[PDB]
Amino acid sequence: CXXXXXXXXXXXXXXXXXXXXX
Amino acid sequence: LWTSGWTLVENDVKVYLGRDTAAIAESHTDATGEHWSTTGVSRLVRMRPED
Amino acid sequence: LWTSGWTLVENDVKVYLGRDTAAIAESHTDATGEHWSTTGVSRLVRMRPEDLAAASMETVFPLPAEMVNDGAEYDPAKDVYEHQMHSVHGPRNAVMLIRLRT
Amino acid sequence: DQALISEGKDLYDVACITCHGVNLQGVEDRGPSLVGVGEGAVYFQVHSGRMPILRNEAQAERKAPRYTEAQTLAIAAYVAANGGGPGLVYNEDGTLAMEELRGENYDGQITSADVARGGDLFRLNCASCHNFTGRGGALSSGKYAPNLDAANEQEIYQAMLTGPQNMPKFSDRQLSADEKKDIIAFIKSTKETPSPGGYSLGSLGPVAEGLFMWVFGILVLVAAAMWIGSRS
Amino acid sequence: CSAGQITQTSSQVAAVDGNQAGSANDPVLVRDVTVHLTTDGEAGVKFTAINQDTSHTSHTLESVTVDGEEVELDDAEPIERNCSLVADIQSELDLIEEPEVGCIQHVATSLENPGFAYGGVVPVEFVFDTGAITIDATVSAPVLESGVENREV
Numbered sequence: 001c002x003x004x005x006x007x008x009x010x011x012x013x014x015x016x017x018x019x020x021x022x
Numbered sequence: 023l024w025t026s027g028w029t030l031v032e033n034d035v036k037v038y039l040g041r042d043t044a045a046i047a048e049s050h051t052d053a054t055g056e057h058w059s060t061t062g063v064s065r066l067v068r069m070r071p072e073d
Numbered sequence: 074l075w076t077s078g079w080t081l082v083e084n085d086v087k088v089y090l091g092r093d094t095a096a097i098a099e100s101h102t103d104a105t106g107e108h109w110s111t112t113g114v115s116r117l118v119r120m121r122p123e124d125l126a127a128a129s130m131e132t133v134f135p136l137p138a139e140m141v142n143d144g145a146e147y148d149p150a151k152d153v154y155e156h157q158m159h160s161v162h163g164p165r166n167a168v169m170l171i172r173l174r175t
Numbered sequence: 176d177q178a179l180i181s182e183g184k185d186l187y188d189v190a191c192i193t194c195h196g197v198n199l200q201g202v203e204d205r206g207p208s209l210v211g212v213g214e215g216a217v218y219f220q221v222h223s224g225r226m227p228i229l230r231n232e233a234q235a236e237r238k239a240p241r242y243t244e245a246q247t248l249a250i251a252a253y254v255a256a257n258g259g260g261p262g263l264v265y266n267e268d269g270t271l272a273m274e275e276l277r278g279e280n281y282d283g284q285i286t287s288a289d290v291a292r293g294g295d296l297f298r299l300n301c302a303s304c305h306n307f308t309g310r311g312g313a314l315s316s317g318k319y320a321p322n323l324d325a326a327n328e329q330e331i332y333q334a335m336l337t338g339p340q341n342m343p344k345f346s347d348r349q350l351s352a353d354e355k356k357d358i359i360a361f362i363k364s365t366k367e368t369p370s371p372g373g374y375s376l377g378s379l380g381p382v383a384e385g386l387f388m389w390v391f392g393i394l395v396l397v398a399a400a401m402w403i404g405s406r407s
Numbered sequence: 408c409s410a411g412q413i414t415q416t417s418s419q420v421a422a423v424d425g426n427q428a429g430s431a432n433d434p435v436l437v438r439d440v441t442v443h444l445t446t447d448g449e450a451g452v453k454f455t456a457i458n459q460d461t462s463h464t465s466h467t468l469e470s471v472t473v474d475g476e477e478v479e480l481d482d483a484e485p486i487e488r489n490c491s492l493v494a495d496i497q498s499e500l501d502l503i504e505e506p507e508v509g510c511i512q513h514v515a516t517s518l519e520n521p522g523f524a525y526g527g528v529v530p531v532e533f534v535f536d537t538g539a540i541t542i543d544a545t546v547s548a549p550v551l552e553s554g555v556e557n558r559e560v
């Protein structure tokens with residue numbers, strides 16, 4: 001009733017994209 | 023009621039005699055389903071005095 | 074109700090994020106009356122990840138690679154308007170892209 | 176210019192001081208940092224009479240301007256010297272463009288082909304937050320998107336350029352110059368055009384047409400019925 | 408009721424690209440920090456260092472490191488009391504002018520463009536004479552000349 005299948009994050013995240021191809 | 027699309031001849035337009043080829047749309051199936059296109063197809067075609 | 078235009082991703086189609094440029098049909102009158110051409114006009118255009126400032130929102134639509142008519146390979150005699158208008162008129166196609174502040 | 180900055184910081188130092196701090200770095204819960212906002216964000220906030228804030232609430236109000244045009248531009252020049260962002264749009268000679276951003280193909284009047292495109296853009300993702308013809312709309316909690324009648328074209332451009340309050344920011348990369356000019360064309364055409372048929376009841380729509388009839392329309396007909404019939 | 412202790416106006420932020428560090432009890436502030444990368448592959452850092460500290464000292468900036476490589480500063484003088492150091496790429500720094508009224512220093516910056524992605528976030532690090540400030544900053548294109556930029560299509 002409260003919530004179907006939506007749950008909070010597993011663990012906090014961080015990254016740097018740095019999508020390069022020169 | 024005066025005009026008939028042949029009246030374009032009086033406006034210095036070059037009107038041909040168009041033979042009806044009764045061409046229909048072409049089906050094209052792609053990654054994005056099937057669609058009917060009429061790009062390459064000409065309904066009316068010019069005709070010759072030997073045809 | 075399971076599917077939208079984005080489901081095309083599953084079956085190996087490359088869909089872009091198409092921004093709506095709200096382009097209309099262009100009038101072209103010459104010797105045989107007036108006609109609305111809507112050829113060479115593209116209403117969905119590809120967008121880059123620099124085109125959006127922080128704290129902004131843009132509605133995007135599923136533009137597959139097949140009906141793209143912009144960039145280096147713009148063909149001014151290619152008609153893609155009706156397909157892009159099918160994309161924009163999908164019941165579940167609209168997606169809002171938000172760039173958040175850092 | 177130099178004198179512009181000089182006398183533009185004096186007005187800052189005696190007004191925009193408590194909030195925003197000395198070096199435009201902001202104060203904790205009084206006002207943000209003015210670093211990088213640009214010459215176009217100061218113009219919109221000051222000229223439109225928004226700034227300065229008098230009290231913290233849900234949303235700052237447009238009111239009577241505190242500064243003139245020249246004073247606004249001086250403060251803007253001073254602010255932009257602390258790291259500049261969006262700038263004012265100019266035309267041919269050094270002057271602020273006003274009746275030039277009335278369409279891409281604008282000459283002396285609005286092209287009907289500009290309002291058509293501007294209308295769809297202004298309705299693509301802009302006709303929601305506000306209204307249909309920019310009559311204003313409600314927001315979350317005491318906030319709202321204001322009626323668009325009071326803003327000049329430069330203010331419209333600078334509003335979208337540097338999204339203020341909750342209004343999202345629209346850069347040139349998102350909405351190009353031509354698109355922005357078309358949006359202005361539509362805005363200024365729908366405002367300045369009288370309704371073809373009738374007295375447009377504030378253009379609000381079904382809620383204003385239903386109050387005119389259900390409360391006022393029926394009352395006249397009741398008064399007519401009360402006149403023909405008897406009270407017994 | 409909307410004018411309480413938590414309001415929707417007091418808590419608002421700069422509404423620009425790139426965040427800041429330090430609020431009240433910090434000697435040095437950085438404002439509006441991004442990694443600018445011009446369309447045609449010209450890189451640099453935008454920031455503004457404000458030296459606001461009770462015990463007036465010398466807070467000269469030694470170096471800036473975006474991810475792995477440093478930044479070419481322009482021998483900026485130490486930031487004194489009620490001063491500022493506005494830095495950007497030279498191309499975007501010619502649009503504004505150095506005031507003679509306060510004490511504001513304009514400095515140009517540059518990078519090598521190793522491979523920054525638009526929309527990505529990178530850990531910019533400032534090293535002063537005393538202390539370092541590390542903040543994540545977005546990678547974005549500089550603001551366009553307003554009102555001149557149409558579409559290619």
Ligand code: HEC
Pocket residue numbers: 223225235236237296297300301304305314318319320321322323324325326327330331334335339340341342343358362
């Ligand atoms: C896209 C084409 C548009 C147009 C034409 C406008 N907006 Fe908005 N807006 C919103 C909020 C909450 C504000 C407050 C701004 C402030 O006063 O600080 C605004 C601001 C404006 C103005 C300025 C007011 C005036 O001068 O009258 C104008 C002219 C304006 N807007 C029109 C709300 C939103 C929003 C979501 C809440 C979105 C999306 C937009 N606005 C976008 C546009």
Ligand code: HEC
Pocket residue numbers: 187190191192193194195205206207209212216217220221226227228229230234235250337338339340416417419420421422423
């Ligand atoms: C309480 C007093 C207060 C004063 C006085 C004040 N401001 Fe502000 N200012 C704010 C607050 C709060 C905001 C938050 C955004 C908003 O509500 O518009 C703000 C926002 C701004 C913005 C929008 C920046 C952005 O893009 O986020 C500009 C520009 C601005 N102020 C400039 C000025 C100028 C110029 C003055 C000149 C006197 C001034 N302010 C005076 C409190 C103030």
